[PDB]
Amino acid sequence: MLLPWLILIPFIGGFLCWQTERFGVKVPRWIALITMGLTLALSLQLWLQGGYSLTQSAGIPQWQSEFDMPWIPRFGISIHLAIDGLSLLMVVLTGLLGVLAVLCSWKEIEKYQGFFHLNLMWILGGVIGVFLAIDMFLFFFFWEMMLVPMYFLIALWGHKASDGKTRITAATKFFIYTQASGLVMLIAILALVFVHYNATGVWTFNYEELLNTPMSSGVEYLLMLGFFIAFAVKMPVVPLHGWLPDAHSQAPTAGSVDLAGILLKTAAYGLLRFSLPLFPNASAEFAPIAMWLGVIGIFYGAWMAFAQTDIKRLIAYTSVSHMGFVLIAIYTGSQLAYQGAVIQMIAHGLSAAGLFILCGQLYERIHTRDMRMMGGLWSKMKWLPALSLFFAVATLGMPGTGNFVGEFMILFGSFQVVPVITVISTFGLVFASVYSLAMLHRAYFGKAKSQIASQELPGMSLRELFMILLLVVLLVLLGFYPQPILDTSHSAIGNIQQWFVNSV
């Protein structure tokens, strides 16, 4: 019963942020902070009361909480929400990143700030709705609903130093990629619903009933391919990755918009919940292609990240390589690799959030993103280079941070399943260390390569420093004590894995 409020509190909060701009120009940030804190508190209350650590795997469907209400009864479409351990971890993560995105938009008080916060809250509510919806039309509706506030945030509130047409080009490329992939998913959804309707005789878009739909291998393969194309655009999977560094580079330069809309990975969750259970035979046949696409993604993202002269594009290609690791993990049949994928998704969220916030602070201090124009910044700044060193170390895959835990559990399970791909992926870890050290050397070490770097810069505020240190503490605790997260996701991950391997 709290799931509809988990979706609705961001929407009502965005509406109140828009409306309460008349009461003051610095008012709607407090409303956004209060509503994102309420969403995070409700997610934590669902975590505490859920008892996920004591839950044993009982098979799909198995929901800790559920909600159903008819929406379009002609097609059997209902607002049907459900939460288990994996969805709960994703919802807590997006609540935390939403609070960080509100705090990162602090002290940016201009006209139509309330509409900026409305767009931010609607993106966050759409992400939560993606994580909660367990019927196909509502999932697709939330999947495509995030793209309009995201488009207008990139195009209208985007990077102010750009040409103005580059922001529109990047936003249009993002929107076309994601909406066309969504339409392919909608075609797959409709064809699955019609196959079920011909097999049984009742219209349904419910995920629980669309399981075990009898269909041939070719039709199941085509439906899996439509779902995979939609998830592969947003994962990102090469060559469908090209929207991501352009969307990151032309995003609003606070960095809050990255955390709100681009940073989270709903596509890995989508693969886990709707690709392996709905089409297990097709996913089993597709697994070599997906794992080789993941290997190509790891190495291509590392090579692209090394070659960038811009920090934001470097972090974007870092994300591409990490999601290649996750994509390898998903198409194995290992509970260990799936738990590593969950830990890696959360750790990538925390580390990429820290990197993007630090990059935004550095850009607002030096007014450039070109690493050829910056250097020797360790001697010129107070807190930023050391925290950037920590977060580059974390994205490198350093033990003591959760990225190592996720990546190495992925590699352990994958080696139990596919050894050659695991060998190549660990060399991908070597390439990750190469690009992290390249970024640290080009940005913060050496001599200053321009006049803007040869000056003492103001230190970070208490708010930015405290939220970065919160991210640091969360990453360190996830690296040293990841057991609560594993116990939370264990039952859902076991259900997905036992559905995937017993039907093949």
């Binding site: 990755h241 090209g242 660990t426 260390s433 050397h441 070490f445 004590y481 057991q483 594993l486």
Partner: protein
């Protein structure tokens, strides 16, 4: 006991305090925090050793918590204590405290004093995690930690880009070693279901009764990780370039912590290596070849730090040779004694560099025995211990035990490789000493001076029970081996005195010859492994990075937009605004529709 976690926590507390101080504290406060954290770690290690010998040298276990538990994948966060762990922990904490006191004196007036001590405290904590780890994944955490702290400390003077390049090279080569170690971890978990050392040794013979191939692969990957961290073949190219940092960093890396990690890894996992005798003999071969190559390359270096770096490579090759001939106690004993005299040598070279200026070449400085007598005495004792002078140096007894273990197991080629290496070790060591030094009693230096003599040889590590006993050689054979090693070292010292002490006509005649120039150029560049690795890995990596710097996959996904724009511009030519053309197009469409309907019928 029950204070191993304290030996980890105190350097961690020092690292956190000195990192978050970010230079605001005075140098006295930061110095006492860093040196006192390492010193209290050493004092707790002393209490732990006293308690360990108070019992019957029994293995102690301190399980802190459970790191991760997914199904049967149950990696625990546990610490273990036996004779090997106590020996490594005592060496690391004591030599690290001596180096920390010397660096407290030495780094005065430098920017990033507290940052330096934070990084060294994190280095000590990572090495203690490495040596005390109950399983292989906690050991991997310590392994990566010492690699990261080596990266942070080698490139300490970050304003010079060459130091940063050296640190990046060291980190990338050791991460290739870490990848090999991770392969070993994956194989061992997939085969045995555990990464605990004792459990792996217990469960290995039952699982590999039919096939031994996967255990051979696991031990080969353990060897790959060990040669990555200890700078052996084929991953030795980083150690010579890693001299860019301060001399306490070099002393810490080359004596206390980093290069001794591979030897500890081989000695700790000896139960798995004894089941694959070919891989253990390969460890011995790698050690012998590495010590020979390092002895060749150290003879032609023109810098004290590079001579000491290739000396470190040669001594780690000696330890690997001792491990490969199943002389484990000799390997750990030589590790301890080499830590002593190499820390002494590096601190004395740092004193030389501080007394002089601009980092002059060894042919520039000369006749320095009268300018600095006590530094000359420290260098003399350290080089005598390195060259294994008989009956006065601990390195003599260490190399004697290594060669006795090589003889007792029927390894003659490895024995003559060790003899040639000892001769060349004396040759290059006293070449540097007679070139530099011919032509205020600090406490760590005095302690290392005492420990570099036979007093350090009096210390016997408590390895009886952890590592198997080396087979005992005959009394006549060990006596003639002692005589042979002694006369080899003595004629090495005397030939070095005849060549480089004096007018140096003969060595200049050899060096100015064309084969002499070719051999000097070959050995100066570390046998061309830097060049080979550059041309084989670094150049094609940069070539692919240049080739991909404008995203090709993004462009081949952008080409549908190009086709759509071209097709739209082509279709817009029909909208010419001419009414007769509109009528004509309607009639054309009528013809096409009627013809299609007639064809389809």
């Amino acid at each position: 006991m029950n204070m191993l976690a304290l030996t980890i926590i105190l350097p961690l507390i020092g690292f956190v305090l000195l990192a978050f101080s970010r230079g605001r504290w005075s140098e006295n406060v930061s110095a006492i925090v860093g040196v006192g954290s390492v010193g209290l770690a050493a004092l707790v290690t002393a209490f732990i050793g006293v308690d360990f010998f108070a019992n019957g040298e029994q293995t102690y276990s301190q399980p802190l918590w459970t790191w991760m538990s997914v199904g049967d994948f149950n990696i625990g966060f546990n610490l273990v204590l036996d004779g090997l762990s106590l020996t490594m922990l005592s060496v690391v904490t004591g030599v690290g405290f001596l180096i920390h006191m010397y660096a407290s004196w030495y780094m005065r007036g430098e920017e990033g004093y507290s940052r330096f001590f934070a990084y060294t405290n994190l280095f000590i904590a990572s090495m203690v995690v490495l040596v005390l780890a109950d399983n292989l994944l906690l050991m991997y955490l310590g392994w990566e930690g010492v690699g990261l702290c080596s990266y942070l400390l080698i490139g300490f003077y970050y304003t010079d880009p060459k130091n940063g390049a050296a640190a990046m090279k060291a980190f990338v080569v050791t991460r290739v070693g870490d990848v090999f170690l991770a392969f070993a971890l994956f194989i061992l978990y997939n085969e045995l279901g555990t990464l605990n050392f004792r459990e792996m040794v217990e469960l290995a013979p039952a699982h590999f009764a039919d096939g031994n191939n996967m255990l051979m692969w696991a031990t080969l990957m353990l060897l790959g990780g060990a040669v990555g961290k200890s700078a052996q073949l084929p991953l030795q190219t980083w150690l010579a370039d890693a001299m860019a940092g301060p001399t306490p960093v070099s002393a810490l890396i080359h004596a206390a912590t980093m290069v001794t990690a591979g030897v500890y890894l081989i000695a700790r996992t000896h139960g798995l290596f004894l089941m694959t005798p070919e891989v253990l003999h390969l460890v011995g071969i790698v050690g012998a070849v590495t010590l020979l190559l390092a002895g060749f390359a150290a003879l032609v270096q023109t810098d004290i730090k590079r001579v000491l770096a290739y000396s470190t490579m040669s001594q780690i090759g000696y330890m690997f040779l001792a491990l490969g001939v199943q002389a484990w106690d000799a390997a750990i004993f030589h590790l301890m004694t080499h830590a002593f005299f190499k820390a002494l040598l590096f601190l004395a070279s740092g004193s030389v560099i501080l007394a002089c200026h601009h980092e002059q070449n060894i042919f520039k400085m000369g006749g320095l025995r009268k300018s600095i007598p006590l530094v000359y005495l420290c260098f003399l004792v350290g080089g005598a211990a390195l060259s294994a002078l008989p009956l006065v140096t601990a390195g003599f007894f260490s190399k004697d035990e290594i060669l006795a273990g090589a003889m007792a197991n029927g390894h003659i080629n490895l024995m003559v490789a060790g003899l040639v290496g000892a001769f060349m070790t004396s040759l290059y060591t006293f070449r540097m000493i007679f070139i530099v030094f011919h032509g205020t009693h600090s406490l760590p230096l005095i302690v290392l001076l005492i420990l570099s003599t036979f007093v350090g040889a009096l210390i016997v590590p408590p390895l009886q029970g952890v590592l198997p006993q080396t087979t005992e050689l005959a009394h006549g054979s060990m006596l003639t081996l002692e005589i042979t090693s002694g006369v080899v070292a003595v004629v090495g010292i005397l030939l070095a005195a005849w060549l480089w002490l004096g007018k140096r006509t003969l060595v200049t005649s050899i060096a100015n010859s064309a084969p002499g120039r070719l051999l000097s150029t070959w050995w100066y560049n570390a046998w061309g492994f830097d060049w080979l690795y550059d041309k084989v890995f670094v150049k094609p990596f940069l070539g692919i990075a240049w080739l991909l710097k404008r995203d090709p996959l993004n462009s081949m996904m952008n080409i549908p937009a190009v086709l759509s724009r071209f097709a739209g511009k082509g279709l817009l030519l029909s909208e010419n605004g001419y009414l007769r053309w509109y009528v004509a197009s309607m009639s054309i469409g009528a013809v096409v529709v009627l013809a299609l309907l007639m064809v389809l019928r």
